[PDB]
Amino acid sequence: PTRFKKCRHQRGSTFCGYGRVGKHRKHESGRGNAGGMHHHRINFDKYHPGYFGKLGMDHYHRKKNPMWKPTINLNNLSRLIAAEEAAKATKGGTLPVVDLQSSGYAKLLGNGHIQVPCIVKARYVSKLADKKIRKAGGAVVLQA
Amino acid sequence: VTMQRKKRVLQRRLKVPPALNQFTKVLDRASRNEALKLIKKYAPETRKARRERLHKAAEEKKAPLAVVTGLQEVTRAIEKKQARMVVIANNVDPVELVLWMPNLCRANKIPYAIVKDMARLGDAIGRKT
Amino acid sequence: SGMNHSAHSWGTGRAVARIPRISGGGTSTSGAGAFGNMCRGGRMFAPTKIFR
Amino acid sequence: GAFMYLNELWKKKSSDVMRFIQRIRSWEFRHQHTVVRLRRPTRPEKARMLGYKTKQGFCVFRVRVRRGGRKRPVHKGITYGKPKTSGVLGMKLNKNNQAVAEQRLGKRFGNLRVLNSYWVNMDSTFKWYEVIAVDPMCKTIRRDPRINWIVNSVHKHREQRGLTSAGRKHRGLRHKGHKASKLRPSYRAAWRRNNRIVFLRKR
Amino acid sequence: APTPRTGIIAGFNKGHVTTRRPRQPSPNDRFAVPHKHLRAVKAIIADLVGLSPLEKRVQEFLRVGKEKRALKYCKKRLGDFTAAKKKRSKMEEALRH
Amino acid sequence: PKGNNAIPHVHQKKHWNPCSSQKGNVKVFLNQPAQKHRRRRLRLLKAKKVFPRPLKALRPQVNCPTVRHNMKRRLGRGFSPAELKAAGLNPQYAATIGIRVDSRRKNKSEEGMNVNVQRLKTYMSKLVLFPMNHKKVQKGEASEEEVKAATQDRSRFGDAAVGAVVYPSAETPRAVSAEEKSMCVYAFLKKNHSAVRFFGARSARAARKEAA
Amino acid sequence: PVEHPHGGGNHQHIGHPSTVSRHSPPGQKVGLIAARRTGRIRGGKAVKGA
RNA sequence: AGACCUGAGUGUGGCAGGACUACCCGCCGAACUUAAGCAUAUUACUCAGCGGAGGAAAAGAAAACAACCGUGAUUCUCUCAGUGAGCGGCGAGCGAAGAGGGAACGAACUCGUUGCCGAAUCGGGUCUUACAAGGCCUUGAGUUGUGGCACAAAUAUCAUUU
RNA sequence: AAAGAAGGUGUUAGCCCAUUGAGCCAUAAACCUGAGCGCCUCAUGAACAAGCGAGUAGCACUGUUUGGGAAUGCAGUGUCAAGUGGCAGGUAUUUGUCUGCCAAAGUUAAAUACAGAGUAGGAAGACCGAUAGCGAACAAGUAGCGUGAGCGAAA
RNA sequence: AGAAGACCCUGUUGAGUUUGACUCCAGUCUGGCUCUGUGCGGCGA
Ligand SMILES: NC[C@@H]1O[C@H](O[C@H]2[C@@H](O)[C@H](O[C@@H]3[C@@H](O)[C@H](N)C[C@H](N)[C@H]3O[C@H]3O[C@H](CO)[C@@H](O)[C@H](O)[C@H]3N)O[C@@H]2CO)[C@H](N)[C@@H](O)[C@@H]1O
Ligand SMILES: NC[C@@H]1O[C@H](O[C@H]2[C@@H](O)[C@H](O[C@@H]3[C@@H](O)[C@H](N)C[C@H](N)[C@H]3O[C@H]3O[C@H](CO)[C@@H](O)[C@H](O)[C@H]3N)O[C@@H]2CO)[C@H](N)[C@@H](O)[C@@H]1O
Ligand SMILES: [Mg+2]
Ligand SMILES: [Mg+2]
Ligand SMILES: [Mg+2]
Ligand SMILES: [Mg+2]
Ligand SMILES: [Mg+2]
Ligand SMILES: [Mg+2]
Ligand SMILES: [Mg+2]
Ligand SMILES: [Mg+2]
Ligand SMILES: [Mg+2]
Ligand SMILES: [Mg+2]
Ligand SMILES: [Mg+2]
Ligand SMILES: [Mg+2]
Ligand SMILES: [Mg+2]
């Protein structure tokens, strides 16, 4: 909306908030990120530190489909179990089966407390997630 | 005409490899005039002689003998070793068409000839060439 | 629109303002100013676009 | 078959027999004109591979191009601006000479639709190509199903637009995969596609 | 025969268990077979035209020894190194009668 | 005064908008609802043109590649000429009776082959196949009580009379087994992982030890 | 100086030596082109040419 | 004498030429500008210049992607991705592809080669209501190969009358 | 009133006029219809061991192009293949295993563009309203101007 | 009055001209292979 603009307010004030001494002039400091090491060195060092250089190996032709590995924790496995089926879940009885790769979530991690024992079918799992679901009463079944 | 006459000098002055020399070495007259007279009498039947014997055989439901002619057909008659003698011309205008042709008869042991022809072979069989 | 002339500024050294002016002569538009939001027959400020 | 002896004889181009025949041919070709019509092609095995038949409307022309790189035609070797664009002699054309030979035939004999050509002979100064053309108004060519497509008026100068085999070479259309991604269907068809600022309607 | 896959994501045979099928014969399986007529044609043409300037040079000093110099002269002029070995090995057969 | 702003990288330096000197390089979607309407109007004009055959030909169920998408399925290009022959069907003949055929696809497993044979077995039982001559019936064809009750689908995939894409059924709730209560799962995963991850790195150390 | 290599200055002088190389480009090859010897020939008379 | 080959001259029947050129195909090809200077780089494989079609053009039927439980011609769209790709005085800046959801889609075929046949071909005449994918006739082209049959969607060749 | 429609008429029209529907009439071919339907003529569907594109690909130097980096594509020249296989698998080399495909010949609809085209005809708009909007609401690329390329009104 | 000082200075503004400025380019020269074949020899390794 043009009517909501600062232009309409300072309409009549003959400098438009740019001043009498130093005017509004076309590109007084350069076009773009010019002068990053020269005359904007204090801006580029203070706010944007690790710019300006090289780091690490070069992965020519990265494919992001084989390096696909999403992550879910033990305390968020209730997101994948239906509400009808968590209430019937007791340790030593019949537990729900969660197929992780049908939901995203290629890897199970072991953060937090698992609020419902279940059988997790995961492509990957960690030390402290395997340890912590076998004591909670479920298991983890590997899949491909 | 001034460069078809200098083309003939230049093929003579330069040292010719033994694969194109062999076409300058030609079967003599008594064996060429004997050969093309035998190619003449077993020439292929003409268009009228092949339009008849078929219209006289569509009445039977109502090739006598010839020499093998053609660069695709004579080649098959040596790969199969069916020809008893092959007669090669000496002056085909891209010479690579029959440059390999005496060595195929030599690998398969069919008797060949290089005669002074391509106008005289086509006259024997009813063609131009 | 407003830009389809071959106008150039006359520079400085005449008592006329530094704007592009219509080339040629023999017509009433010749020498007249061009190519600005304030000239007549010139182009509007920030001409409107269909990718708004 | 009879082809296999012709094809393997034209792979022995550096042997002493084929170096004698191309010696004689390159002599008698540089005493002819730039464009020469033949009754029969010089290489019939390679002409019929490339599309020629011994029909009525087919016809073969041998076309001569000069060898070497492209001297940039700036006046007196003097050129301006940035130093990357300063070279005159080492610059090279982005069309091969087989395409240039096909375009010199078809810009000269306008009533004929050229299909592709083939290498014939080299000299130190010239290269020769037999360019197969075909007469689109010949009644044989119009009634024959495997060649009548050339009579349609979208093939009028295939050579001038890079639609022959030698045209498709210097366009890079020998490659299809990750080796041709910037150039499928055209460099301009991919430049336009990759650079046009798309404005979605509700955004 | 097609070596069934183990149903976990990592390791040897690391896939989904899926009852693999045998490879089926294609028309492109007929390139790895001996071409006994294509060789007989090439043997007639080679016994017709003589030898290349490369092929005479490679085996004029394959008589005096110099087998790694024949391989270096081929790879300079053939570019490829597998083709350099094969061209030297085709000259050693013409020297074997 | 610049402040704590992100470094811009806006990529608009190549003469893209039509000004008084530039033709532009710009693509706007103002005809989006009129080409939306055109394609539908032209699919209803085509569904009349073909009637009563399906508007879209039958396509196989194929998996998806690239381990991100292994668990997904979609519709392929055409049935291979081994799924067609396993359905007792000529591939040159199948293209006339509404089936897409793909000579390139290789059938590397029997589960993916049997899914698409069952799509072909379902399709032939729904197929009507009108006669050439509606007086002299030549083969198993329609009987004109079928060649008059016949209709088409506009079902957008050809999956009206073959059914949708068959995903597998999720596993029923079960108990934790005797092995799964005590067998460590990470150690078996990492042993299998490290076997291929250090193959060659440890297989040359034995090669550095079989030789002295 | 725009027209000729010897032109210009405040005195009419050739600045550089007026004996130019054989390999000078056209425009630079003015003056005494590839002079083997200059000056008033004091002595005999050598035939001129290569 | 005649032939064949390579070239002429005329007769007859045809065609190309210029226009337009928004989009599209092939080449040719800058500089201002940006880098707070400037030469690499940028602008831009853009403007201008030359050639050529169409109602679209171009591409297109795997010497492809992938690394999967695999996919399946091209083109286009959203996304991939302003990218923990990559290129770059590694500066200013630039810059994709595979996968996935879709649009379209009856989408596939023809030579060459090989094998088996060998003028069964093509053009001109002329006769059938007919410049017949018909007969009949023609040395006129053509055997220095026109055509037919088979080649992964394949199960193969000729008969013939149903 | 299945018609309210938005133009004209001396001043604000559903009723003054034209309009605004169902349908009627007439059609060179082409297009579409049991690949519409007969006849003549002419084709013919189904039954009863060989190889597959050679100055090519590659390689070297140079030039350019690319995100393509010990070289993505191309060009020049030198060199120049293999098939008792070759190409691609995004860090160069030699050697293996693997996987995909079979370059160097040809046609091919639609989905895409129309960023200063054109024909025939529609729909219009939170646009402009005679210094605005096309230069041009008018005998406008006109009168005029310049040797010319060209420039170019007012109204 | 005339005309955004024609002097002087500033600008990370030009341009004509110069040159053992910086980066290059035509031209001229020189070497390599090429075009480029046939003989009898000779100096060589
Ligand atoms: N208020 C200033 C005006 O903002 C206008 O643009 C404003 C919006 O129209 C514009 O919104 C854009 C949207 O148009 C575009 N299609 C996509 C984008 N996601 C939006 O940006 C939005 O998300 C970004 C962060 O992602 C916010 O910074 C921004 O404020 C928000 N509007 O960003 C601006 C924030 O108000 C015009 N650029 C211009 O008229 C003017 O600068
Ligand atoms: N020829 C190379 C060019 O030399 C130029 O630079 C050269 C010039 O500045 C200068 O060249 C001078 C020349 O001006 C002056 N009039 C004559 C003098 N002979 C030259 O000198 C140069 O050339 C001769 C060899 O002929 C050398 O003996 C000498 O060492 C060398 N300095 O010496 C530099 C070294 O050659 C440019 N840098 C460039 O165009 C290019 O590098
Ligand atoms: Mg480093
Ligand atoms: Mg303009
Ligand atoms: Mg205006
Ligand atoms: Mg793409
Ligand atoms: Mg024209
Ligand atoms: Mg600009
Ligand atoms: Mg500046
Ligand atoms: Mg242009
Ligand atoms: Mg096309
Ligand atoms: Mg044929
Ligand atoms: Mg090459
Ligand atoms: Mg095409
Ligand atoms: Mg008014």
* DSSP string of chain D, one letter each residue: -HHHHHHHHSS-TTSTTHHHHHHHHHHHHTTS-SEEEESS-S-HHHHHHHT--SSSSEEEEEEEEE-S------GGG---SSGGG--SSS---SS-HHHHHHHHHHTTSTT-EEEEEEEEEE-SSEEEEEEEEE-TT-HHHHH-TTTGGGGSTTSTTSGGGT-SHHHHHHTTTT--STTSGGGSS-HHHHHHHHHSEEE-S--
Long-range contacts at A95-100 (CB < 8 A, ≥ 24 apart): A95/A119, A95/A137, A95/A138, A95/F173, A95/F174, A95/F175, A95/F176, A96/F173, A97/A121, A97/F170, A97/F171, A97/F172, A97/F173, A97/F174, A99/A143, A99/F170, A99/F171, A100/A72, A100/A143
CB F181 within 8 A of CB A134: yes
Amino acid letter for position A93: G
Question: Experimental technique used?
Answer: cryo-EM
Instruction: Please report the sign of the dihedral spanned by the C-alpha atoms of residue F84, residue F86, residue F87, residue F90.
Output: positive
CB B128 within 8 A of CB B120: no
Instruction: Please report the sign of the dihedral spanned by the C-alpha atoms of residue B78, residue B82, residue B88, residue B92.
Output: negative
Query: What contacts A14, CB < 8 A, 6 or more positions away?
Result: none
Nearest to C49 by CA among F16, D200, F17: F17
Pairing of strands D113-122, C8-9: unpaired
DSSP strand E in B1-129: where? 86-88, 112-114
F100, closest nucleotide (Cα–C1'): H106
DSSP SS3 for F26: strand
Pairing of strands D35-38, F61-63: unpaired
F92: CB within 7 A of chain H nucleic strand: yes
Is C50's CB within 8 Å of F17's CB? no
Query: What contacts D5, CB < 8 A, 6 or more positions away?
Result: B75, B100, B101, B104, E41, E44, E45
* Cα–Cα distance for residue pair G28/G47, rounded to 1 Å: 27
* Cα–Cα distance for residue pair F132/F134, rounded to 1 Å: 6
CA E77 distance to own-chain centroid = 18
Is F174's CB within 8 Å of A139's CB? no
H or E stretch at A120 = strand A119-122
Residue E70, burial from CB neighbour count under 10 angstroms (0-12, 13-18, 19+): buried
Resolution (A): 2.5
Both ends of chain D: CA-CA distance in Å? 67
Amino acid letter for position B12: R
* Cα–Cα distance for residue pair F9/F15, rounded to 1 Å: 16
* Cα–Cα distance for residue pair C27/C5, rounded to 1 Å: 14
What single DSSP character describes residue C8? E
Is C51's CB within 8 Å of F20's CB? no
For residue F106, the distance in angstroms to the closest alpha carbon of chain D comes to: 20
Q: Which tokens belong to A112? A: 């937090």
Amino acid letter for position D37: R
A38, closest nucleotide (Cα–C1'): H36
Q: Which tokens belong to A62? A: 């990265």
* Cα–Cα distance for residue pair A127/F188, rounded to 1 Å: 11
* Cα–Cα distance for residue pair F173/A90, rounded to 1 Å: 12
* Cα–Cα distance for residue pair F38/E97, rounded to 1 Å: 77
DSSP SS3 for A130: helix
Pairing of strands D197-199, F26-28: parallel
Angle at alpha carbon of residue A115, lines to A114 and A121, rounded to 5°: 55
Is F28's CB within 8 Å of D199's CB? yes
Query: Residue D158, Cβ neighbours under 10 Å: how many?
Result: 19
Question: How long, in residues, is chain E?
Answer: 97
Q: Which tokens belong to D72? A: 């940039």
CA-derived radius of gyration, chain C: 13
The two most distant CA atoms of chain D are separated, in Å, by 73
Residue with tokens 């079960």, as numbered in its chain: F174
CB D126 within 8 A of CB D132: no
* Cα–Cα distance for residue pair D26/D6, rounded to 1 Å: 20
DSSP SS3 for B79: helix
CA-derived radius of gyration, chain E: 23
Amino acid letter for position F189: L
List the alpha helices (DSSP H) in C1-52.
Answer: none
Nearest to C51 by CA among F21, B49, A95, F18: F18
H or E stretch at A6 = helix A6-9
CB A101 within 8 A of CB F168: no
* Helices E36-49 and B101-108: angle between axes, nearest 10 degrees: 120
F85: CB within 7 A of chain H nucleic strand: no
Instruction: Please state, in angstroms and as integers, the Cα–Cα distance from residue G16 to each residue in B18, E78, G20, G31, following that order.
Output: 68, 55, 10, 11
Amino acid letter for position A130: D
H or E stretch at F27 = strand F26-28
Question: How long, in residues, is chain C?
Answer: 52
* Cα–Cα distance for residue pair D86/D74, rounded to 1 Å: 10
Instruction: Please state, in angstroms and as integers, the Cα–Cα distance from residue D8 to each residue in E38, E55, E85, following that order.
Output: 9, 16, 22
* Cα–Cα distance for residue pair A121/A100, rounded to 1 Å: 6
Amino acid letter for position A52: F
User: What separation in Å is there between the alpha carbon of A61 and the centre of ligand 3?
Assistant: 19
The gap between B41 CA and H136 C1' (Å) is 29
CB B113 within 8 A of CB B27: yes
The upper half-sphere exposure of residue A16, i.e. CA atoms within 13 Å in the direction of its Cβ, equals: 8
Q: Is A126 on the interface with E (CB under 8 A)?
A: no
The bases of strand I with some atom under 7 A from any protein CB are 33-35, 50-60, 62-64, 66-69, 72-91, 93-95, 99-108, 112-116, 131-136, 141, 143-146, 150-154
In chain C, what residues touch F30 (CB-CB under 8 Å)? 50
Which residues neighbour strand J (beta carbon < 7 Å)? Answer: A 38; B 14-15; C 12-15, 18; D 23, 26, 76-77, 79, 83, 86-90, 123-124; G 1-2, 5, 8, 15-16, 22-26
What is the DSSP annotation of B49-73?
HHHTTTTTTSSTT--------STTH
